């Protein structure tokens, strides 16, 4: 099928490879990105341990919240790689990895 | 291939999310071990930790959501209005959320599947915003009905829940019907249904060699249908039954959430179907019959409900001022009026839900409200101001706007039907005021105090309310920002 | 350096004191609402003393964004005809605190606290130099007097004259909203020293003198709406009536002598 | 308050509210919809989709497939 | 006062909306 | 009337909070999710007090 | 001045105080959550104030984007 | 001319939908069968303007409303169904 | 008597210090 | 109840009861004023806006009108309440509500005795 | 003719669901409205949409309303964008080309359907799936009783 990747805005941040691989996008992953992706998946998996109490189901309230957590911390860890590699965000390392490449 | 749907990770995450929730529910809910536990309240908290991560999604990819946009041109488009119409939807939802948790734990509503609904809504409205076809935006539209049918009728025991659903299916399903048919015919007549096509085919002949039977008629059902979703008069067949029988927090969310995405749709409907000003005139008819029918019939309501049900028309014809007046600054008057009804509806929806524990129904039943909690009657007589539109609140800077931009057009009859509606609608709003403070019944009724979520909702709506004047310069920005990146 | 930003902020932190206080301890209550009345008090003093008395210009012109563009803000400043209402209008506030000195353990804080609420509201009245916060302010006053007068009321007839006074002030309100919102779309902006050098056409002079007139000739009862008065003055309570008579009143001609007449 | 410094302020802030008068006239001055708003690249994108999607079948010109052979 | 201007006023006479808001049923 | 008085005044604080647990559990009803799952939540026996304190002696 | 720091941590303390008082609860019931709920008033204020600043500058682009759309109607 | 009569017909199956909505407001089975014409008439005219103008975009959108009135069925019948129960009369 | 017996318990623990640990870096890193 | 009515101890709002007071089975309307040492047998009426004397008994099914003073073993009518006694009967009620929330604010959510508990535990083992 | 026939038969059918005492006897030319609109589409060349439109609204829809009639209660209750060719056509007919390139490799309604239905516009495909999966989920909690 046909696709395009051109975006109405243009990116206002040098562009390294611009459409990059799933592969390569999480290879990219900065400090940052596993802070990020850490503290949500904390967070979704505190508030369903609190959450699941008074029904009584811990353990289960927990794996929920941390499904919930992980699906969601890996995509906006994604969604922030891919907007640095395709230079919709400043990629301030990603320029820096890439020159002496 | 997968970067393609970095424009679509916001609607993935909350379609996952909620098919998790199910699944958990559903699962959970039909055990053994756990003596068949009633987890209403862990899925309501895990369906607002969606939410607020969907938020997150949304909010910080702002960048990208022209991303492939070529690609995505035929099902959806989205620009500057779509993102803060979606991110002021999912705030919404995620304050009814907050809102409805404690109305599954005194009254034990024990059913997950009302969070699921709301989720799916919720994604349907979603998908709504950013429609840019009449086919996705028709399928929206029915995938938020049917979620909304299914819970109005939630209290299946009870005689109003039911006959409040089947109305409201009833409704939905005429009105559908009358968009549906107006869609057909503007399909027919020029062979197109994406919103660019439709509007090249129309912006050149504007009715200047003759007038499209066709096409007047397509635009003239749309505009009906659209007149039934927000309950414009004479189309308010049911709402106000509609209101009352239905439970407490669903109607929370029916009086705030189907309107943001709607309002959305009309717009993105003006964008293009300004044919010859014909919407023009049906919403400068059905504003001045909205506000003076609202006005009107809100002095003659006993029961607290109705009253809000009225309020809500009558606002609704308030921003209906807006639409006849086509012009950025009538836009940007009809977005700031949207927005500062929906916090007052919050609001107002939270002071009942904290009352409903005790069963309020009448407006006399809060009459000594001023002696038993005499803080929770100082906010409800703010919300009531802030609707009122006394000036000092923010509920006057909504109205002040939208006189203005009814000025600016030169319609001097509106101005006219709006002061005066505004004198009856703060008589009858104050009459609610006078109760709390002034009278002294024999007999007092007893409220329980309220929980963290609505108490830490209320006193941020509050505190928005009064001091919104001292600095209301950003929503202004932002407003007038949707309004231009409407056309450009 | 005694600015008008303090003279208004000296009530709310008043008021705002006052909110969370505990209610048992009524002498606390009583002293931090005089003692704020008083500071204000002689601040307005002292704001009479450092004030030029040569010059026409607006004197301690203070400004504060509103709109977004500007187009519409935050202008205090006084004048040799408002100086004197400002100063009246803090002085009568600790007079009004000690009428209800002996009666305060029945009232309460909400008592302290609208009077306060009403002296911040009057003082920026006399003091807003822009046309459309001037309305803001003009017609913010009737929530701490429609409390005022209901909750503290002396019979039952309260309800009925707070009833009358509220609606004929929204009459008048709405029709000079009307007027202002003509004035800001034709002139362009709100502030009076920009309204006071635009030529407006002989035409809209007429209309927009009328609905000036609407509003102002309420609080200032001519001869057709004198009939609220007598009721909201008898059924008010005794600190309730100086309020509607030393300064209510001097609304309607304070607008006339500032608007209407330039 | 210094008198020079008082009558200074009065007349800038009276000519920047003028400036500022005039050009919120000007914006107010602005129509809905712009002059030639189908023009601009956001409202043109079936021009550069269908160019892409011009080869998919179900979209050819009939004498299209039948000159693909060589 | 109590009159011609009370019955013209506010009470007198426009309380009507009584007569004219009960309506609103039909 | 002693006795029942005399058999809540003597429980100990393993007992106390597992019969707080249950009166939590069981202050508030709903027949329809019931209905809907197949189930009949009863009051615990801890819950219950003989039908001679009752005022007319009310079995169900 | 007021800076956005302390007029945020006022709003902070206000709201939590005022979630406390709707409850029938002691003003200063729980006095960790006070500190928190100032804390989070700062940075929203703080946010607010940065948000409305480039909020502004966006304005300004997209209107001399119209207006500069508008002017070519002359030619 | 057959495109006249193809919408004249339909035109007619909406018309009788609404009356049948309205004339029949006692009874709740007859509400939604009318509901079900005017949804029928709407495919029609879809499926026609589609056949008409050489165009596959009404033929997707009839088989896209197909779903959403028999979804729209099934909520109604469960609706009333419910609705019996309680009250025991229609 | 000096070990926590709860191993649903324990990870609710880890995981919310976990989640300071992130915000506080997330707020410091950024 | 001997009178019929339902038995249940109901006491209305702005109801001071004055200590040693012995309650059965009565229902006290609002603004009331009960003495020191006195008794309210079952299915006894107190009307609203009156005042019991201390040491005062009335006997079941005895009623108080609302607006007098009664007082006595075997309670009987003293004279006829003035408006600024029945208007400053809830002051009194708001004075002690006063004072009880002054007492409130002594004591927080949870003792520290089950430390005490803890370290007598600890000197005996476990 | 065939389209006179096979329309007035269905405004017969219309009228009579929309103006009938027994339920059954409404919810049978409600039948019937379908079975006629169905030869309808046939006559368009829409062979897919006819036979869907027997398989779901007379097999799914109208089972459905049979069984809630039956078991439940059975109780009693132009000119201006196309204007007409006239009847013109003993020298139209003979004006008919035939461009033989659009005949050579020929689809058919239903693969002319699933060339787009699935890659082009499967977005408001996933739409549908949820409606109907909402259908799914409303129809238990407001209809169940177990035991
Ligand atoms: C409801 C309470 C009512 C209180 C308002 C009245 C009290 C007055 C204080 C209002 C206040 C806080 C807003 C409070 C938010 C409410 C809380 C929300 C809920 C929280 C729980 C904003 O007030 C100022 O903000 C300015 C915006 O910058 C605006 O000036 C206009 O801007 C142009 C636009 O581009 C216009 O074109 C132009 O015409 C105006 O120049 C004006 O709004 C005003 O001057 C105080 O200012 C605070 O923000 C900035 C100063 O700017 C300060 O830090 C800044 O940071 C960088 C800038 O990001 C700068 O680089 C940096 O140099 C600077 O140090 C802060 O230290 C503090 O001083
Ligand atoms: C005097 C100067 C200092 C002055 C300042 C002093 C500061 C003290 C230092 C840190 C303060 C920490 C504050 C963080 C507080 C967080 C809230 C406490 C959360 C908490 O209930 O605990 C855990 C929960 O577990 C987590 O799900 C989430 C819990 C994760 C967070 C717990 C991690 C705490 C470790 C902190 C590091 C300590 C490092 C050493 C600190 C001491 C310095 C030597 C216990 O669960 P649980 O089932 O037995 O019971 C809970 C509990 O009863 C209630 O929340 C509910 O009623 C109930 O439903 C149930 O949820
Ligand atoms: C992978 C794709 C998604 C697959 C699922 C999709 C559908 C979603 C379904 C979600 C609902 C079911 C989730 C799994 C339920 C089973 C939960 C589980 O495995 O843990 C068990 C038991 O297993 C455990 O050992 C506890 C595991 C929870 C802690 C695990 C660490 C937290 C993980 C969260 C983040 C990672 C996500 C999950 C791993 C991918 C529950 O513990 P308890 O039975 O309460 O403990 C027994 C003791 N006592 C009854 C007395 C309390
Ligand atoms: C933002 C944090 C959100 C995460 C918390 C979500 C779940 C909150 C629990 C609500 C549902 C619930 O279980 O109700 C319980 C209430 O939940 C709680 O008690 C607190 C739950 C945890 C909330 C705070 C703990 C730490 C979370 C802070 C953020 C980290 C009932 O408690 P109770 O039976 O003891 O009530 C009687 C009362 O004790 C007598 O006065
Ligand atoms: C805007 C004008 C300015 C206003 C001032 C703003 C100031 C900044 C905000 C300050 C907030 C201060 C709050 C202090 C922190 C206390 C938070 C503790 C809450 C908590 O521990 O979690 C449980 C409840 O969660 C909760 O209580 C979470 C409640 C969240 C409700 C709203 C959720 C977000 C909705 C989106 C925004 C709202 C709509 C906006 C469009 C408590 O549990 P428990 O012990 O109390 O017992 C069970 C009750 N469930």
Request: charged letters at 15%; glycine letters at 8%; proline letters at 4%.
């Amino acid at each position: 099928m046909n696709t395009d990747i051109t975006a109405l805005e243009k990116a206002q941040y040098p562009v390294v490879d611009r459409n990059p691989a799933f592969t390569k996008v999480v290879g990219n992953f900065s400090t940052l990105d596993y802070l990020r992706f850490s503290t949500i998946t904390g967070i979704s998996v505190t508030v369903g341990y609190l959450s699941g109490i008074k029904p009584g189901i811990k353990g289960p309230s927990m794996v929920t919240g941390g499904l919930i957590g992980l699906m969601g911390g890996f995509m906006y860890a994604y969604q922030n790689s891919a907007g640095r590699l395709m230079g919709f965000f400043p990629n301030d390392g990603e320029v820096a990895s890439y020159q002496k490449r | 291939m997968f970067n393609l749907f970095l424009a679509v990770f916001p609607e993935i995450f909350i379609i996952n999310a909620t098919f998790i929730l199910l699944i958990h529910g559903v699962v959970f809910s039909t055990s053994k071990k756990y003596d068949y536990p009633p987890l209403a309240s862990n899925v309501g908290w895990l369906g607002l930790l969606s939410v607020l991560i969907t938020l997150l999604l949304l909010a910080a990819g702002a960048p990208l959501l022209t991303i492939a946009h070529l690609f995505w041109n035929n099902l959806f488009r989205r620009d500057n209005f779509t993102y803060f119409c979606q991110i002021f939807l999912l705030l919404s939802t995620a304050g009814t959320i907050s809102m409805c948790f404690d109305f599954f734990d005194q009254e034990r509503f024990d059913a997950f599947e009302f969070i699921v609904l709301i989720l799916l809504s919720t994604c349907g409205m979603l998908f709504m915003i950013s429609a840019y076809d009449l086919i996705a935006m028709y399928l929206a539209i029915e995938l938020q009905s049917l979620c909304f049918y299914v819970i109005a009728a939630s209290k299946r025991k009870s005689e109003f829940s039911t006959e409040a659903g089947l109305k409201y299916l009833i409704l939905g399903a005429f009105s559908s019907g009358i968009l549906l048919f107006g869609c057909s015919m503007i399909y027919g007549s020029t062979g197109a249904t994406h919103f660019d096509q439709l509007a090249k085919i129309l912006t050149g002949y504007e009715i200047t060699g003759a007038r499209s039977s066709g096409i007047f008629m397509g635009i003239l059902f749309i505009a009906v249908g659209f007149l039934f979703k927000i309950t414009a008069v004479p189309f308010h067949m049911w709402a106000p039954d509609i209101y009352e029988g239905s439970p407490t927090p669903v109607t929370a969310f029916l009086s705030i959430a189907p309107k943001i995405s709607i309002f959305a749709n009309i717009l993105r409907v003006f964008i293009y179907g300004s044919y010859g000003a014909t919407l023009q005139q049906i919403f400068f008819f059905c504003s001045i019959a909205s506000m003076i029918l609202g006005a009107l019939a809100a002095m003659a309501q006993t029961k607290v409900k109705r009253l809000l049900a009225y309020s809500s028309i009558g606002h609704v014809g308030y921003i209906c001022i807006g639409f006849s007046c086509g012009t950025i600054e009538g836009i940007q008057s009809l977005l700031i009026g949207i927005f500062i009804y929906a916090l007052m509806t919050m609001d107002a929806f939270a002071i009942v839900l904290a009352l409903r524990q005790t069963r309020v129904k009448y407006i006399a039943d809060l009459g000594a409200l001023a002696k038993t909690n005499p803080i929770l009657a100082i906010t409800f007589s703010i919300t009531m101001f802030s609707y009122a539109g006394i000036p000092p609140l923010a509920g006057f800077c909504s109205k002040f706007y939208l006189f203005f931009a009814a000025l600016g057009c030169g319609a001097y009859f509106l101005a006219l039907v709006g002061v005066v509606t505004s004198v009856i609608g703060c008589f009858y709003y104050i009459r609610l005021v006078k109760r709390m403070f002034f009278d002294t019944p024999r007999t007092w009724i007893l409220y329980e105090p309220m929980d963290r979520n609505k108490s830490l909702l209320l006193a941020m709506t509050s505190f928005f309310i009064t001091l919104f004047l001292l600095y209301p310069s950003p929503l202004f920005s932002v407003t007038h920002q949707m309004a231009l990146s409407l056309y450009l | 350096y005694f600015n008008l930003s303090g003279l208004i902020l000296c009530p709310v932190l008043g008021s705002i004191i006052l909110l969370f206080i505990p209610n048992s301890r009524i002498r606390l209550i009583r002293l931090i609402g005089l003692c704020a009345s008083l500071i204000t008090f002689l601040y307005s003093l002292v704001l009479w003393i450092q004030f030029d008395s040569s010059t026409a210009k607006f004197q301690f012109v203070e400004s504060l964004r509103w709109l977004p563009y500007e187009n519409i803000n935050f202008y205090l400043g006084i004048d040799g005809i408002s100086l004197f209402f400002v100063i009246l209008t803090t002085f009568l506030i600790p007079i009004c605190i000690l009428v209800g000195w002996s009666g305060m353990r029945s009232y309460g804080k909400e008592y302290i606290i609208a009077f306060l609420i009403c002296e911040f509201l009057m003082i920026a009245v006399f003091c807003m130099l822009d046309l459309l916060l001037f309305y803001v302010f003009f017609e913010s006053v009737l929530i701490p007097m429609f409390i005022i007068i209901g909750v503290w009321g002396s019979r039952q007839r309260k309800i009925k004259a707070a009833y009358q006074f509220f609606l004929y002030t929204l009459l008048g309100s709405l029709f000079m909203l009307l007027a202002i919102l003509l004035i800001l779309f034709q002139t362009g902006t709100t502030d009076l020293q920009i309204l006071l050098t635009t030529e407006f056409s002989e035409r809209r002079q007429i209309f927009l003198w009328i609905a000036f007139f609407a509003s102002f000739a309420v609080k200032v009862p001519m001869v057709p709406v004198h009939i609220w008065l007598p009721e909201a003055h008898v059924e008010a309570p005794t600190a309730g009536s100086v309020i509607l008579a030393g300064i209510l009143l001097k609304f309607g001609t304070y607008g006339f002598l500032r608007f209407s007449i330039p | 308050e210094n008198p020079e410094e008082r009558d200074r302020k009065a007349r800038e802030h009276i000519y920047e509210m003028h400036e500022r008068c005039k050009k919120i006239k000007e914006m107010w001055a602005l129509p809905i919809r712009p002059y030639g708003f189908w023009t601009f690249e956001r409202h043109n994108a079936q021009l550069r989709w269908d160019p892409q999607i011009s080869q998919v079948a179900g979209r050819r010109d009939p004498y299209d497939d039948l000159l693909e052979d060589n | 006062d109590k009159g011609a201007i009370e019955i013209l006023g506010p009470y007198g006479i426009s309380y009507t909306f009584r007569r004219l808001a009960e309506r609103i049923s039909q | 009337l002693a006795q029942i008085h005399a058999s809540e005044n003597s429980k100990s604080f393993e007992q106390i909070e597992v019969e707080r647990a249950l009166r939590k559990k069981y202050a508030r009803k709903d027949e329809d999710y019931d209905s809907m799952l197949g189930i009949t939540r009863e009051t615990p026996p801890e819950l219950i007090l003989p039908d001679n304190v009752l005022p007319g002696g009310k079995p169900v | 001045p007021i800076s956005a720091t302390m007029v945020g941590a006022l709003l902070g303390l206000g709201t939590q105080m005022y979630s406390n008082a709707l409850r029938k609860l002691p003003y200063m019931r729980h006095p960790w959550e006070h500190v928190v709920g100032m804390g989070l008033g700062a940075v929203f204020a703080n946010q607010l104030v940065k948000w409305d600043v480039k909020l502004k500058e966006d304005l300004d682009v997209m209107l001399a984007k119209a207006r500069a759309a508008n002017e070519r109607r002359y030619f | 001319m057959d495109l006249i009569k193809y919408f004249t017909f339909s035109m007619i199956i909406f018309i009788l939908g609404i009356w049948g909505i309205l004339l029949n407001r006692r009874n709740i089975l007859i509400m939604l069968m009318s509901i079900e014409l005017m949804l029928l008439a709407v495919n029609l005219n879809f499926l026609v303007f589609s056949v008409s103008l050489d165009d596959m975009m009404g033929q997707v959108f009839a088989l896209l409303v197909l779903t959403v009135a028999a979804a729209e069925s099934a909520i109604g019948l469960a609706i009333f169904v419910i609705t019996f129960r309680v009250r025991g009369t229609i | 008597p000096k070990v926590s017996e709860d191993k649903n318990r324990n990870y609710a623990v880890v995981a919310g210090v976990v989640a300071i640990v992130g915000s506080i870096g997330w707020y410091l890193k950024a | 109840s001997p009178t019929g009515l339902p038995a249940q101890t109901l006491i209305d709002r702005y109801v001071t009861v004055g200590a040693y007071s012995l309650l059965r089975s009565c229902t006290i309307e609002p603004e009331c004023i009960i003495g020191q040492h006195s008794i309210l047998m079952e299915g006894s009426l107190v009307e609203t806006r009156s005042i019991l004397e201390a040491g005062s008994v009335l006997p079941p099914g005895r009623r108080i009108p609302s607006g007098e003073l009664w007082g006595g073993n075997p309670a009987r009518f003293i004279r006829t309440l003035t408006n600024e006694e029945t208007l400053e009967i809830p002051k009194l009620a708001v004075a002690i509500n006063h004072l009880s929330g002054d007492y409130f604010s002594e004591f927080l959510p949870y003792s520290t005795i089950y430390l005490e508990v803890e370290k007598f535990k600890k000197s005996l083992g476990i | 003719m065939i389209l006179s026939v096979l329309s007035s038969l269905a405004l017969v059918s219309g009228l009579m669901v929309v103006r009938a005492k027994n339920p059954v006897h409404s919810v049978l030319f409600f039948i019937l409205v379908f079975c006629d609109t169905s030869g309808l589409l046939l006559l368009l060349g829409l062979d897919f949409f006819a036979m869907i439109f027997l398989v779901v609204y007379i097999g799914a829809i109208a089972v459905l309303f049979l069984f809630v009639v039956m078991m439940f209660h059975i109780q009693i209750a132009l000119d201006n964008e196309s204007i007409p060719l006239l009847p013109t056509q003993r020298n139209t007919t003979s004006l008919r080309y035939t461009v033989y390139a659009g005949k050579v490799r020929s689809w058919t309604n239903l693969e002319t359907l699933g060339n787009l239905l699935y890659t082009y516009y499967f977005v408001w495909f996933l739409v549908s799936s949820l409606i109907l999966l909402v259908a799914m989920i409303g129809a238990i909690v407001l209809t169940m009783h177990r035991t």
